[PDB]
Design an enzyme around this catalytic site. Structure first.
Site, PDB file in Angstrom:
ATOM      1  N   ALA A   1       0.852  -1.185   0.000  1.00  0.00           N
ATOM      2  CA  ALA A   1       0.000   0.000   0.000  1.00  0.00           C
ATOM      3  C   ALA A   1       0.888   1.236   0.000  1.00  0.00           C
ATOM      4  CB  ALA A   1      -0.901   0.015   1.232  1.00  0.00           C
TER       5      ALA A   1
ATOM      6  N   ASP B   1       2.687   4.454   1.143  1.00  0.00           N
ATOM      7  CA  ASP B   1       3.163   4.762   2.483  1.00  0.00           C
ATOM      8  C   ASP B   1       2.379   5.911   3.107  1.00  0.00           C
ATOM      9  OD1 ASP B   1       5.131   2.806   2.106  1.00  0.00           O
ATOM     10  OD2 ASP B   1       6.559   4.267   1.297  1.00  0.00           O
TER      11      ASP B   1
ATOM     12  N   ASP C   1       9.312   1.313  -1.204  1.00  0.00           N
ATOM     13  CA  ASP C   1       8.323   0.985  -0.177  1.00  0.00           C
ATOM     14  C   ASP C   1       8.938   1.104   1.214  1.00  0.00           C
ATOM     15  OD1 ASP C   1       6.378  -0.001   1.461  1.00  0.00           O
ATOM     16  OD2 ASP C   1       6.315  -2.013   0.565  1.00  0.00           O
TER      17      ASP C   1
ATOM     18  N   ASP D   1      16.192  15.030  -0.763  1.00  0.00           N
ATOM     19  CA  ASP D   1      15.314  15.124  -1.925  1.00  0.00           C
ATOM     20  C   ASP D   1      13.889  14.576  -1.773  1.00  0.00           C
ATOM     21  OD1 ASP D   1      15.257  15.699  -4.941  1.00  0.00           O
ATOM     22  OD2 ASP D   1      14.687  13.579  -4.916  1.00  0.00           O
TER      23      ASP D   1
ATOM     24  N   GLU E   1      13.926  18.970   1.225  1.00  0.00           N
ATOM     25  CA  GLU E   1      13.234  19.674   0.163  1.00  0.00           C
ATOM     26  C   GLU E   1      11.779  19.228   0.173  1.00  0.00           C
ATOM     27  OE1 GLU E   1      12.261  19.752  -4.526  1.00  0.00           O
ATOM     28  OE2 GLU E   1      12.903  17.971  -3.413  1.00  0.00           O
TER      29      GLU E   1
HETATM   30 CA    CA Z   1       4.232   0.961   1.154  1.00  0.00          CA
HETATM   31 NA    NA Z   2       6.291   4.173  -1.121  1.00  0.00          NA
END
Ligand code: CA
Ligand code: NA
Ligand SMILES: OC[C@H]1O[C@H](O[C@H]2[C@H](O)[C@@H](O)[C@@H](O[C@H]3[C@H](O)[C@@H](O)[C@@H](O[C@H]4[C@H](O)[C@@H](O)[C@@H](O[C@H]5[C@H](O)[C@@H](O)[C@@H](O[C@H]6[C@H](O)[C@@H](O)[C@@H](O)O[C@@H]6CO)O[C@@H]5CO)O[C@@H]4CO)O[C@@H]3CO)O[C@@H]2CO)[C@H](O)[C@@H](O)[C@@H]1O
Ligand SMILES: OC[C@H]1O[C@H](O[C@H]2[C@H](O)[C@@H](O)[C@@H](O[C@H]3[C@H](O)[C@@H](O)[C@@H](O[C@H]4[C@H](O)[C@@H](O)[C@@H](O)O[C@@H]4CO)O[C@@H]3CO)O[C@@H]2CO)[C@H](O)[C@@H](O)[C@@H]1O
Ligand SMILES: OC[C@H]1O[C@H](O[C@H]2[C@H](O)[C@@H](O)[C@@H](O[C@H]3[C@H](O)[C@@H](O)[C@@H](O)O[C@@H]3CO)O[C@@H]2CO)[C@H](O)[C@@H](O)[C@@H]1O
Ligand SMILES: OC[C@H]1O[C@H](O[C@H]2[C@H](O)[C@@H](O)[C@@H](O[C@H]3[C@H](O)[C@@H](O)[C@@H](O)O[C@@H]3CO)O[C@@H]2CO)[C@H](O)[C@@H](O)[C@@H]1O
Ligand SMILES: OC[C@H]1O[C@H](O[C@H]2[C@H](O)[C@@H](O)[C@@H](O)O[C@@H]2CO)[C@H](O)[C@@H](O)[C@@H]1O
Ligand SMILES: OC[C@H]1O[C@H](O[C@H]2[C@H](O)[C@@H](O)[C@@H](O)O[C@@H]2CO)[C@H](O)[C@@H](O)[C@@H]1O
Ligand code: GLC
Ligand code: CA
Ligand code: CA
Length: 481
Positions: free
Chosen positions: A182, A184, A203, A232, A262
């Site tokens: 899924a 994050d 992930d 970044d 950033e």
């Molecule tokens: Ca994930």
């Molecule tokens: Na992710």
């Protein structure tokens, strides 16, 4: 005493593999001009030799292995990089390395992966059922082997991609299916869930990934002797991951690494949320300020200069703001083009360099120019302002953002710096003057414009006040020099 960092690169630098060498020999000059820290471009192997570095392929290949058709990166070899770092350290300059952990691009091969498409405008909305796609998720690093690290990447280390090699459809975003898969959280909410950005999205829910990135962070720090990081695309990365990654690296190295993230969104509220969620353990670029500066430079004098700092990070949370005028994304032709016009640029740098709040940064593109797009070197106009920051921008600050065109502020100075103190005055419209308080102990002093824009002098009266002047669409910085 005042610190000033410099982004030592721009997007259109030539792919000549000589940038590390340029930085190497420019070290003493930078230190003499007031630069105390340098943010270097991505040092690892990108998807190709001419990649700026954000198409991050192998974080352990710092221009050392034969991968992607080249040994060196766009900037040079690992040895040249190490030589540049040593040169900076020998000149008392701190080094901040860029850090790309949101995604990986330039995979060695594709894999068949189960996934569902999601709405690009609302990634939390699945728009198709589950089916198999061919995704660029396999990384084996054939040119590096297991040197430095034996970790190999596969589809399960990613949350999704935007390209199915077997159907090649445009404008699609694929969310992988599988145990615990899924987007994050937490991440920015534009588009519902902004976890996905480009390439193969890492992930952060995978234990192996977290452990590997933390380990790489330490390796990276110890290998180059980094003093800090420029992080970044953090609005696309699980907030708690970034927070804990920074803490892990600091603990493992026993070094209080400086870190600037950033978070690119012209929204103070979103940035404040990010700061709170990461427990204020690092700074962020003042993106809102960049847009205020940009908009002011495009308003032909009709911008209300009294509001230049409204909605900015430096105004609200000065201790956590890194103020910048422009960068590689805001420069001409780039993704977030919003380049501060040349006439306003000196005012912009005075606004970031001579005030007491924030950690200011100088952009390579502005300082040395951007030849490919007709942007001249502006160091001749920036240097005087850097000198003002190094020698005069100290002590109590008195604000005079009280006119729609002409604004100013003074610094009363301190005993730690001789003859310190200043009076900055600027106008985005017609020139004029403003009475400002610089301190009673300055009575009788004869100040002059360090920028050279105004050639006269200003004598501080017996009460500590001076009638400072400025030309139209310009900035003057009066000091007791
Ligand atoms: Ca994930
Ligand atoms: Na992710
Ligand atoms: O001979 C030419 C070329 O051949 C070989 O390249 C092959 C490569 O080895 C192989 O992996 C594959 O490449 C795949 C790639 O692995 C996939 O991840 C996929 O990449 C595309 C990616 O998913 C897309 O998101 C898209 O990336 C865009 C972003 O979407 C843009 O937002 C933009 O991002 C930049 C941003 O504007 C900047 O502000 C900054 O943040 O930096 C960002 C990153 O640069 O640009 C990127 C890049 O365009 O497009 C990606 C594709 O470019 O799909 C790839 C296949 O299409 O296949 C390659 C071709 O066969 C060889 O290895 C190379 O050395 C050689 O140059
Ligand atoms: O965020 C910006 C955009 O990013 C993504 O676009 C990428 C693709 O993901 C890359 O795969 C690549 O696209 C190539 C493509 O690989 C190549 O085959 C060719 O595409 C052909 C296609 O095969 C054919 O069936 C037909 O449709 O014509 C296409 C054009 O010739 O060329 C593509 C472009 O070079 O690069 C693009 C651009 O970076 C993402 O998919 C986009 O949705 C997103 O806007
Ligand atoms: O003293 C000469 C001139 O000074 C004043 O002009 C300034 C403008 O008021 C100020 O906005 C700025 O002009 C810039 C525009 O805003 C921008 O859109 C673009 O056109 O670049 C201009 C600068 O190159 O700066 C000028 C001074 O250079 C005053 O208003 C004039 O009446 C007066 O003639
Ligand atoms: O460049 C050398 C210097 O860099 C780092 O110092 C910076 C801070 O990390 C950063 O928070 C910022 O701090 C200033 C606040 O932004 C400002 O509002 C006001 O409170 O002054 C602070 C500095 O006194 O900027 C500094 C750079 O001046 C790093 O932490 C240092 O160890 C390093 O020596
Ligand atoms: O398709 C088999 C298997 O793949 C993935 O498991 C990975 C796992 O995530 C890695 O940490 C490591 O253990 O390698 C495994 C593959 O050998 C899926 O996560 C899993 O559900 C699936 O069964
Ligand atoms: O620990 C949470 C802390 O958050 C806030 O303090 C911030 C402050 O807002 C920032 O401007 C900067 O000074 O960093 C602080 C955290 O070190 C709250 O103001 C505070 O009450 C709360 O404890
Ligand atoms: O498309 C370029 C940019 O557009 C918007 O500003 C998005 O908020 C930002 O995430 C994206 O990078
Ligand atoms: Ca992400
Ligand atoms: Ca105005």
């Amino acid at each position: 005493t005042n610190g000033t960092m410099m982004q030592y690169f721009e997007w259109y630098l030539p792919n000549d593999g000589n940038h590390w060498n340029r930085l190497n020999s420019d070290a003493s000059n930078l230190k003499s001009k007031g630069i105390t820290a340098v943010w270097i471009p991505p040092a690892w192997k990108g998807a190709s030799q001419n990649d700026v570095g954000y198409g991050a392929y192998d974080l352990y290949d710092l221009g050392e292995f034969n991968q992607k058709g080249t040994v060196r990166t766009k900037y040079g070899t690992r040895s040249q990089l190490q030589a540049a770092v040593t040169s900076l350290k020998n000149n008392g300059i701190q080094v901040y390395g860029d850090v790309v952990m949101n995604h990986k691009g330039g995979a060695d091969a594709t894999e068949m992966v189960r996934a569902v498409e999601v709405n690009p405008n609302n990634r939390n909305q699945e728009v198709t059922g589950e089916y198999t796609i061919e995704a660029w998720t396999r990384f084996d690093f054939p040119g590096r082997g297991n040197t430095h690290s034996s970790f190999k990447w596969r589809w399960y280390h990613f949350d999704g991609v935007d390209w199915d090699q077997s159907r090649r459809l445009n404008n699609r975003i694929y969310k992988f299916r599988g145990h615990g898969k899924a987007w994050d959280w937490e991440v920015d909410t534009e588009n519902g869930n902004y976890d996905y950005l480009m390439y193969a999205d890492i992930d952060m829910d995978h234990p192996e990934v977290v452990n590997e990135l933390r380990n790489w962070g330490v390796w990276y720090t110890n290998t180059l002797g980094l003093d800090g990081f420029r992080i970044d695309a953090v609005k696309h990365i699980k907030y708690s991951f970034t927070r804990d990654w920074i803490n892990h690296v600091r603990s493992a190295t026993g070094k209080n690494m400086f870190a600037v993230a950033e978070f690119w969104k012209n929204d103070l509220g979103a940035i404040e949320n990010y700061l709170q969620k990461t427990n204020w353990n690092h700074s962020v670029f003042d993106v809102p300020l960049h847009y205020n500066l940009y908009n002011a430079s495009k308003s032909g004098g009709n911008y209300d200069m009294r509001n230049i700092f409204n909605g900015t990070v430096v105004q609200r949370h000065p201790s956590h703001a890194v103020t910048f005028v422009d960068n590689h994304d805001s420069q001409p032709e780039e993704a977030l083009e919003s380049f501060v016009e040349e006439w306003f640029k000196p005012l912009a740098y005075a606004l970031t360099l001579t005030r007491e709040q924030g950690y200011p940064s100088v952009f390579y593109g502005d300082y040395y120019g951007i030849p490919t797009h007709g942007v001249p070197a502006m160091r001749s106009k920036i240097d005087p302002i850097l000198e003002a920051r190094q020698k005069y921008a100290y002590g109590k600050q008195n604000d005079y953002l009280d006119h729609h065109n002409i604004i100013g502020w003074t610094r009363e100075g301190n005993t730690a710096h001789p003859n310190s103190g200043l009076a900055t005055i600027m106008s985005d419209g017609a020139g004029g003057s403003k009475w400002m308080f610089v301190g009673r102990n300055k009575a009788g002093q004869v100040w002059s414009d360090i920028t050279g824009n105004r050639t006269g002098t200003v004598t501080i009266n017996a009460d500590g006040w001076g009638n400072f002047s400025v030309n139209g669409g310009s900035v003057s910085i009066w000091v007791n020099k």
